[model samples]
Target: MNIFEMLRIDEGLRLKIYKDTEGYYTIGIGHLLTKSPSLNAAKSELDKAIGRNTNGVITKDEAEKLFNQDVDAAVRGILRNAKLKPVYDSLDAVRRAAAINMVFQMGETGVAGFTNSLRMLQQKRWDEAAVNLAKSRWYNQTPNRAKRVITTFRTGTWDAYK
Candidate 1:
């Protein structure tokens, strides 16, 4: 059988929209709905396929394509947003990677909520930024991940989750 069919079997096929574990709107084999600009385009295509105002089924082929397109747009959104772009460009590759990971995990807007930590980064205060990053709820929720990212930020080297 096809991979899409396998995915449908694994992820479970649902004819109507549903929410994923994080509460995002989703439909058709675990596709996470997004608010990125391409959302409109994806929605437009979905509407064309199944009408805008009503719940309906998505073909396995459609689900696969939509998932790919949505992921592409999400990556583009992270790379293009000003909050992420500035930090990305300013840091060394390793540090930039840490910053990108933070953006990916928390979102640009959410990372922006780390105002003092971000300010420290912009000021080139690596030590302070690392400390500030570790002070957040995100860090408290995931200490090992925080250590890796904080170490990368402070020293510009990979810490391997140690």
Candidate 2:
């Protein structure tokens, strides 16, 4: 399922998600879900993802200057990798989700953008994978506002792909 149908996104949330994708994925964003057939399902996924990621932690600390292409590029790049025989054959949803998160945070060229993290993860290099995963955030703002949210993710309080 596409991101819109997968997230059950509303108009506002759709715009937000599109904008987020642009900024995080480096792709030209569009509103293809204007007449989506599975809007309910899409919204459900979006809500779950947002709640899991934000956890009410996104306060007045306006998000950094993000573009719409970033998110689309990230998702597109991840989808490309996930469609590969080796990657698709081995990686689980959790691993894929982590990769997606890393892409969203670090852009398509981030550590998660490469297959190394997933390869390390599949090899059971949990620590190394986590370390490589953290590299995605090395260039980020390191916002304190997101610490707890990320903690929740690392602690496994939330599920993959929300």
Candidate 3:
């Protein structure tokens, strides 16, 4: 199996249409449609795959492709981050999953905004990183998921999310 499969659990699967907590249209296991990079084209595809509107469906295989793409994008964004890249390169696969999850949920800029937290992470100060993360609005926005991500950072384990 690939690392992308880990996303299947955290993001879950969706064949139809739904709005994310942030009110953006998303489909196919958190394939966000409002993203500017491909919003029109992807939204058009979503409109076609599901419908001209909602209450429609896409096949799991179709959804799977989108899921892979999203996961790949998230990973790339994490690596593209100059500050975060070094921390990412130093992590084991399980700990790395936590970083990917953060990017997946918040995008590159959002994760990079974790100024103090990323610094702590780069220094291998796990609890400090966790504490810093807990103090962010992201933790308030997605409390449960954030806690799991924080736990992974704190312990270098995937048990909380996996």
Candidate 4:
């Protein structure tokens, strides 16, 4: 399956507005409300589509479209990071998704700041990359997610993340 499918599977599709784990208002497959203009615009578009306020709901198809847009934008952002383009482009879909997940969580610059981790990844030193990832503040903040992403980085599979 595609990255969107994988993310939807991982994030869980929700038609109605609901609170995320951090209790942020979210809708349409883990789209968290934030200061990001793109995301806010998306939420507004979704609300308009459903013909209601932020309290509106969406159908599965609508949710899928919105989710696709978000994922695509994130993937594009990851792809555009010059420092990572070489290695990021070389990775297979699953591994690319792992990187995309990281960039999505910690913006392109944030992930780029993982100098050692990026070096390990670029060098194809899977174990070293995993180790580097585990040592980062991101890992401490979200151990489970970090473990899954690191495993994917090492193994080039979604088994851990899925």
Candidate 5:
């Protein structure tokens, strides 16, 4: 299945999908879109209503210092809360890493509710889950690559391309 068939996204975000430099559709993130100063502050602002840090973006090192443990716990918590147990079976490592990347970049609520992809995946509906993930707001970032990666995972044929 393709992404749209698996997980879906918020209607507003889905409508915002557009092409980026890679010649693939992506949801845009402009200065206004990602105007937060730091991920920690961003997370709190975006979800938990914690509070803002600085008005400047958080550096990678700063991100590690501020949010690394939170990131790990967020990922593990997703796995723990998952309704479907998984073995990855085919593209586990790659997709897991990618999923973490998505979560890291987006945060817990951003990764979870923003796309609604994790819910299906937890149900072991691999095809549907992948489709949902593929057609998500992330897909707008790079549709073809998203589709390609999902295809690799779904078919369990990673070596076919590389």
Candidate 6:
């Protein structure tokens, strides 16, 4: 599957606004309303994606636009980082998605702190990369997801999670 489709699967697409784990008001694949523009502007943006006025509801098809846009933003966030850009381009499709998956979860700056792990991936040191990634708070917090990412680095495939 394409990154967009894959991420839509990874990040559940909720059709209506709701409270996220952090209690932030979120909608449509984790889009946060608190950090968005004015409430009016956010509604306007959502309306454009929904292609009509909504009574706090969104169609799956229309919401795909919002999800795609989010993936694009996350992809760019992964690509433009000074540390990741070159290495990211060097990866194969599946491997590249690993980076996108990470940046989507934890913004670019958060990933940037993984200098050692990123360096291992840049060198294509799969085992080292996997080992490096496991020794972290993120891994402890999200072992299942984190393990999948590490497996992708080691095997260069989505077999671990997909």
How would you encode candidate 2's per-residue C-alpha lDDT over 73-122 as one tens digit per residue?
Answer: 66677567643335534555444444444454554555435466566666
Once superposed on the true structure, which residue ranges of model 1 sit more than 4 Å away at CA?
Answer: 1-75
**Model 6 reaches what TM-score against the true structure?**
0.79
Model 5 — TM-score against the truth?
Answer: 0.41
Clashing pairs in 6: none
Using TM-score as the yardstick, the better of models 1 and 3 is 3
lDDT of 1 by residue, 22-124 (tens): 4555666566554434545445545664445433456666666665554454457757877756755676766765665565445667676787887788788
- The segments of candidate 6 whose C-alpha lies over 4 angstroms from its true place after superposition are 35-56
Q: Can you rank all candidates by TM-score, best first? A: 3, 6, 4, 1, 5, 2
Model 3 local distance difference test score:
0.77
lDDT per residue for candidate 4 within 85-155, as digits (tens), equals 88788787788888877776666767766988878888889998898889887888778777877888999
- Per-residue lDDT over 59-119 for candidate 5, one digit per residue giving the tens place of the 0 to 100 score: 3343333343444554675566443124222235545544544544455556556445655
Regions of model 3 farther than 4 Å from truth? 1-5, 35-56
Question: What lDDT score belongs to each candidate, Candidate 1 first?
Answer: 0.62, 0.40, 0.77, 0.74, 0.43, 0.75
The residue ranges of model 2 lying beyond 4 angstroms of the native Cα positions read 1-73, 82-85, 112-115, 135-140, 143-162
- lDDT, model 5, position 86: 44
Best by lDDT: 3
Candidate 6 per-residue lDDT over residues 18-78, each given as its tens digit: 6554455567886655545355655665666567887567877766777777778888876
Model 6, position 92, has a per-residue lDDT of 88
The per-candidate count of clashes, in order, stands at 0, 27, 0, 0, 10, 0
Instruction: Tell how far residue 61 is off in model 3, in angstroms.
Output: 1.0
**Model 6, position 147: C-alpha lDDT score:** 85
